[PDB]
Amino acid sequence: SVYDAAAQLTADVKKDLRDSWKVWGSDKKGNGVALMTTLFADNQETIGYFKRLGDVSQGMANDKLRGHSITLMYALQNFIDQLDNPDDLVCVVEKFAVNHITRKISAAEFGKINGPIKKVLASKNFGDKYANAWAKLVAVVQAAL
Amino acid sequence: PSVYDAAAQLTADVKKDLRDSWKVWGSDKKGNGVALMTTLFADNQETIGYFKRLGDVSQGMANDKLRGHSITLMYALQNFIDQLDNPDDLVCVVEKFAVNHITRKISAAEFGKINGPIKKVLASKNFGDKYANAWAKLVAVVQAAL
Ligand code: HEM
Ligand code: HEM
């Protein structure tokens, strides 16, 4: 249930998401690409899905990857901005869920992003507490896949 | 001309006008995004068919898929606004969204149909022709990629 999953985003969780986003979302290009490179580096079996972007190993030097990465951070920005209204959060989550269903990405594989998120956040001094919060948000998308 | 040529041609004045108008128009993404789409469908009814995935686009705010689409479109514009000072960054995100439309057979001319609606929504907030023209220049950067 995408709606029950959305209900998991309590006041304490929303705060942790906002607090960490103040830092993580401040450098969308830089952090977006780092998130993607981490995903590819630690989950090589997901690289094939990103064929359109060309050679993702080039990281920041890859223009299509950079564009994809920046845009991904705006999807998260979108989510953050919908935390006040469950209905709006759900409709945008569904929109992106469709994008991933077309790419044949399951709830389980979408969840492979949690490891990379925990890692990049940890590098910015935002521990398991924050990783767990972001996992709850990722779980809303998972519920829609 | 290239997309970069269209992106690097955006002047300090055009960026100023884009930013000033976006501060207001982009502040309520849900409300103004849906208004933008509704306006496109009111004046360019021939484009309705392309949006069949969203369901009944005349349902406005009630239509959650239209709302989801509209809010996200406004974040695409947000993205654009945030990349104005770095042509390299603007071009790569413009190209990304260009692909989203190329795959749906949306031509440069068809994409440019969004200018009429933008001019009206901006006008409703008292941002006149100068601002409509500025936004037309940004839309043209995407057209350079279509
Ligand atoms: C925080 C988690 C994630 C977010 C918010 C996210 C967001 C996005 C966005 C905004 C797009 C562009 C959609 C489009 O224009 O069609 C996208 C594309 C894509 N995503 Fe994700 N995504 C996430 C995680 C993942 C993961 C873990 C996978 C794979 C296991 C995945 C696979 C894809 C693929 C293959 C594309 C298409 C790329 C292309 O060919 O342009 N995503 N994602
Ligand atoms: C300010 C100008 C516009 C921007 C920023 C923009 C942005 C977007 C975005 C972000 C998407 C989602 C892409 C995806 O996830 O696959 C989208 C989808 C789409 N756009 Fe646009 N767009 C603009 C104008 C137009 C115009 C004028 C047309 C039609 C003549 C058009 C036709 C489409 C179609 C058919 C879709 C697919 C909708 C769906 O089935 O989900 N767009 N657009």
| Contacts for A58 with CB less than 8 Å, ≥ 6 apart | A65
CB A119 within 8 Å of CB A40: no
Determine the distance from the C-alpha atom of residue A53 to the mean position of all C-alpha atoms in its chain, rounded to a whole number.
18
Side-chain-side CA neighbours of residue A37 (13 Å): 15
Nearest chain B Cα distance for residue A53, angstroms: 10
- Torsions phi, psi of B90, nearest 5? -60, -45
**Treating both helix axes as pointing N-terminal to C-terminal, what angle do B12-25 and B64-83 enclose, rounded to 10 degrees?**
150
User: What residue's CA is closest to ligand 2, atom 33?
Assistant: B101
Tokens encoding B90: 């603007």
The resolution, in angstroms to one decimal, equals: 1.6
Place of tokens 């000072």: B85
Nearest chain B Cα distance for residue A73, angstroms: 10
Collect contacts of B79-86 with beta carbons under 8 A, ≥24 apart. B79/A70, B79/A71, B79/A74, B80/B138, B80/B141, B81/B18, B81/B19, B81/B22, B81/B26, B82/A28, B83/A70, B84/B10, B84/B15, B84/B18, B84/B19, B85/B15
**3-class secondary structure for B2-40?**
CHHHHHHCCCHHHHHHHHHHHHHHCCCHHHHHHHHHHHH
- Closest to B36 in 3D by CA, of B65, B71, B63: B71
DSSP string covering B86-146: -HHHHHHHHHHHHHHHHTTT--HHHHGGGHHHHHHHHHHTT--HHHHHHHHHHHHHHHTT-
Dihedral over alpha carbons B92, A26, A32, B13 (to 10 degrees): 0
Q: Can you tell me which atom of ligand 1 is nearest the CA of A74?
A: 10
CB A31 within 8 Å of CB A24: yes
CATH of domain B1-146: 1.10.490.10
Residue ranges of domains in chain A:
1-145
CB atoms under 10 Å from CB of A84, counted, come to 9
Domain A1-145 has CATH 1.10.490.10: yes
CB atoms under 10 Å from CB of B122, counted, come to 22
Name the DSSP class of A2: H
CB B74 within 8 Å of CB B33: yes
Q: How far apart are CA B56 and CA B40, in angstroms?
A: 14
CB B6 within 8 Å of CB B141: yes
A20 burial via Cβ count (<10 Å: 0-12, 13-18, 19+)? buried
Ligand 1: centre distance to CA A25 (Å): 17
Breaks (C-N over 2.5 A) in chain A follow: none
- Closest to A69 in 3D by CA, of A112, A30, A106: A30
